[PDB]
Amino acid sequence: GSSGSSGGSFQYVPVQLQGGAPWGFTLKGGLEHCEPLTVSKIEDGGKAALSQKMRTGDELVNINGTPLYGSRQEALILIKGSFRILKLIVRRRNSGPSSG
């Protein structure tokens, strides 16, 4: 007998945009500064916000279907040349009501 319980759950919210940039969403941190690349700012009124799928605090690891490796540049850059539709997958480590 020894303490050992598993409790690592995560939810991927695929934010599918439509209309074309600008979207109205940015990021901060990244492997560069050893920070979890997560939404830093999202224009309230653009596309990103209108989607109501993501919000400042989510972790984006997939942009336009491109799996990032934590980096930032490649990320923000992948957007600069977005298309009529944007595909992103943010993971939120839901917690609170769960004991452990």
UniProtKB/Swiss-Prot annotation:
- The domain of life for this entry's organism is Eukaryota
- Please give the tissue specificity annotation from the record for this chain: Expressed in all fetal and adult tissues investigated. Expressed in adult heart, brain, placenta, lung, liver, skeletal muscle, kidney and pancreas. In brain regions detected in cerebellum, cerebral cortex, medulla, spinal cord, occipital pole, frontal lobe, temporal lobe and putamen. The expression is strongest in the medulla and weakest in the cerebral cortex.
- Segments forming domain PDZ: 12-94
Per UniProt, subcellular location reads as: Cytoplasm, Cytoskeleton
* Signal peptide range: none
Tell me how this protein assembles: Interacts directly with F-actin.
Role according to the record: Probable regulator of cytoskeletal architecture that plays an important role in development. May regulate cellular and cytoskeletal architecture by modulating the spatial distribution of myosin II.
> What pathology is it implicated in?
A chromosomal aberration involving SHROOM4 is a cause of X-linked intellectual disability (XLID). Translocation t(X;8)(p11.22;p23.3) with FBXO25.
Q: According to its UniProt record, which protein family does this protein belong to? A: Belongs to the shroom family.
> What name appears for this protein in its UniProt entry?
Protein Shroom4
> Which organism does this record belong to?
Homo sapiens (Human)
| Gene behind the chain | SHROOM4
Which part of the entire sequence is included in the shown chain? 6 to 92 of 1493
